Design a protein around this ligand. Structure first.
Ligand SMILES: [Cl-]
Ligand SMILES: [Cl-]
Ligand SMILES: [Cl-]
Ligand SMILES: [Cl-]
Ligand SMILES: [Cl-]
Ligand SMILES: [Cl-]
Ligand SMILES: [Cl-]
Lengths: 172, 172, 172, 172, 172, 172
């Protein structure tokens, strides 16, 4: 047992490692979206940069789980990062609907881990998840939800002018 | 094909996608080293931070290939990022030796790509490789060799004091 | 021969003179586009200014060739600058389409010159072309391609509101 | 007819297009002199720069005619730019004598245009020519004449020492 | 083999050692010229300083080759530095003609090395030579050629007044 | 005879030329040490920089004798610079020991020259040697002797940790 380990159940250590992988998968999916919107036949650079920023955010979240593992005396165990669901993301509305889906998947995993930490009576892990993940997760979901509503208002996917205006004004 | 595409061979497009993935693989390997040296039973923080910074470098190299692909009108195609070779890296010397081997693997892949771009008569790709990758590769390989020489001079793996001193004096 | 001349083939000297003339031809073509978009019955000032800047860019590229010729001990021989292919450029999308074609023509000529320099074993001329022309060319081609994608998304050529939006938001 | 056009005769419109071309032809001749004085076997750098500056001045004059045409609702029509009269310019005195003749040729054409504008009762065109062209012409002719006087005083064309001193002291 | 060595042919390693000796030889020749123009019976101090600065430049070039050798895992092997070809250099024109001959000799040796590096498929070596040597060589040759033309215009070697003026106006 | 020459014996003139060469010989020897400690299988950067600095110092000493020769109306006569005694310098201790013997050799040559200048009754030469050479010689000899004592206290050649520590602490 690690000399620093105290009140840190094996189940939670395994769950932290799975959560880290899921954060990396999300980061990679966001990188794919960045690359798509940067294509010459797509050309929505502000949208591309939005997704690049979220890729970086999700990578930072995974790195925080690595540091957390070590702080508690757990051991980081890495797995392969699966390639994203799609190679092409259709348009701004499809990609944002996919980001909403992804965010909710990550959120549900964090809520699952929080419930496990509550059940194992690990208040440090609960506090970490509340402070560093749950809040930002709700904020991100709301932001993307707001975007979806505006994209639909702007006539997406049919309305090319509306897609241009979104890139210029909602993610400028 | 893409309206921007000019003098960009399909073999080179494909090789850029493979190169991007190898850079991500190297980034992930370095992240594993960072997490190892941050363990409470290893605790070499400066060494940990050295590998963290190299994980950042390799990820930036991958992103530059993504951007490059789009510039030339190629299409980014992502694959799975394989987990690193080891979960545990032994000590600073073993880790640096592993790092040297990784850097020489990435370097050979970049030289292989440069030769393909040469055979295919693509000066833009050659120049990109020369400026953005080839010189940093040689620099990074020289630094790591220098580190290995010093670690051996310090009596690694056996000399714990030598290892402590390297971490305080050789890395940032 | 000139006292400074070394490893500079007569074919490369002649090709540099042709390349200089092609750059002046390109500069003159962009000048015509500037004057078209500045007409009272066209009146897209930011579009006009975009072509004015590219006119000034192409003229600088020709000037760089003149200086290069003297540096290597070659002799600048000027020829007539042909008038542009059109007096009127239709609209922003037709003009960008023509600019893409022109940039690809200039790019192919630079690529042909690099191939000659390679074959004639002139690495100074190869390096000049890579560092001063090839990089800029690919960037300019990517930007124009992105513009055309967005112009099509905005409903050009028929959609005047789309063309107005482009002038206000994509160029500047 | 253009919505903005008022008191702008077709003869004046046509003459502005011819004037535009002449200014470009002057600019190109000056470019040729710059390239000549930058030759390794000529090497009078300040003389070269003086001619480069005049090339720039004449191009700006052409551009101002383009803008003027549009302001009045005339239509820019571009023609081939003829290559300069010579490939090599002999020496500073011969180039300066050539420049004086070019400058008087452009001046006469501006004077003939002003006479046409007067005859056609176009005071706006008269005022434009007076403010933007006629004054600069007389100043340039005076400067070049002064230079020719000094080059002869210095024993050009035979006195190489005089030519060197001119390049160091009379041109900036 | 050195642990850092990769894609670095022994022929190139040998050629790098020969190249740095040649740079040292050129440095020493320039130092001799410095010492000659500082003589009380020559007394052309700005000419002397020009040669001193070029001696320093060529010394730095050799040192860059030593650093390069180590960066690639090659081994610096030093040889004797031959004394310069002459003990006295006649006058400014003779010395600049000698400097041109020397610069073209160095340039040819660099071009030979680039060709060897191309043949051995070493793009790292190619890029180094292009960026750090070939560009500056061409600039140095042009500058010296320009000076020769000017010394000949000023009546060298016969014209003592001309030589005085060159020292006061073309150098320092 | 030079118009400036006064109280300057031919024997002393020749001795200054011999002294110049030995300073160059010393500079080249320190350059060799610089390159050795910069090897990837040696990698003591601070020690390498120490020897680079002393290489610079001896070069400056050689230049100063060239200038002195000219000030007195003597004539600089250059001879070949012999390659250093060794291609490889063992370790910091061996290198410092070799540096001490080299410094002693240069110092004996300067004392011999001072003695000749004394016998030939040349106080200007005596004074030049005292102020510009003899004091820094004694300082440099004391510094290297101090280094050697410390390297021995540190347990060189065998104590690798001792060598690492000296590089981090005794040299700049
Ligand atoms: Cl416990
Ligand atoms: Cl769209
Ligand atoms: Cl009217
Ligand atoms: Cl210039
Ligand atoms: Cl000629
Ligand atoms: Cl190899
Ligand atoms: Cl150059």
């Amino acid at each position: 047992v690690s000399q620093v380990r105290q009140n840190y159940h094996s189940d939670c250590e395994a769950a932290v490692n799975r959560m880290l992988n899921l954060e990396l998968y999300a980061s990679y999916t966001y990188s794919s979206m960045y690359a798509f919107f940067d294509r010459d036949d797509v050309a929505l650079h502000n949208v591309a940069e939005f997704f690049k920023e979220h890729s970086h955010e999700e990578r930072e979240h995974a790195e925080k789980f690595m540091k957390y593992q070590n702080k508690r005396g757990g051991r980081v165990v890495l797995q392969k990062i699966k390639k994203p669901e799609r190679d092409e993301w259709g348009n701004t509305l499809e990609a944002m609907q996919a980001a909403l889906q992804l965010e909710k998947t990550v959120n549900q995993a964090l809520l699952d881990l929080h419930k496990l930490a509550t059940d194992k009576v690990d208040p440090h892990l609960c506090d970490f998840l509340e402070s560093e993940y749950l809040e930002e997760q709700v904020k991100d979901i709301k932001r993307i939800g707001d975007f979806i509503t505006n994209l639909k208002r702007l006539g997406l996917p049919e309305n090319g002018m509306g897609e241009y205006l979104f890139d210029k004004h909602s993610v400028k």
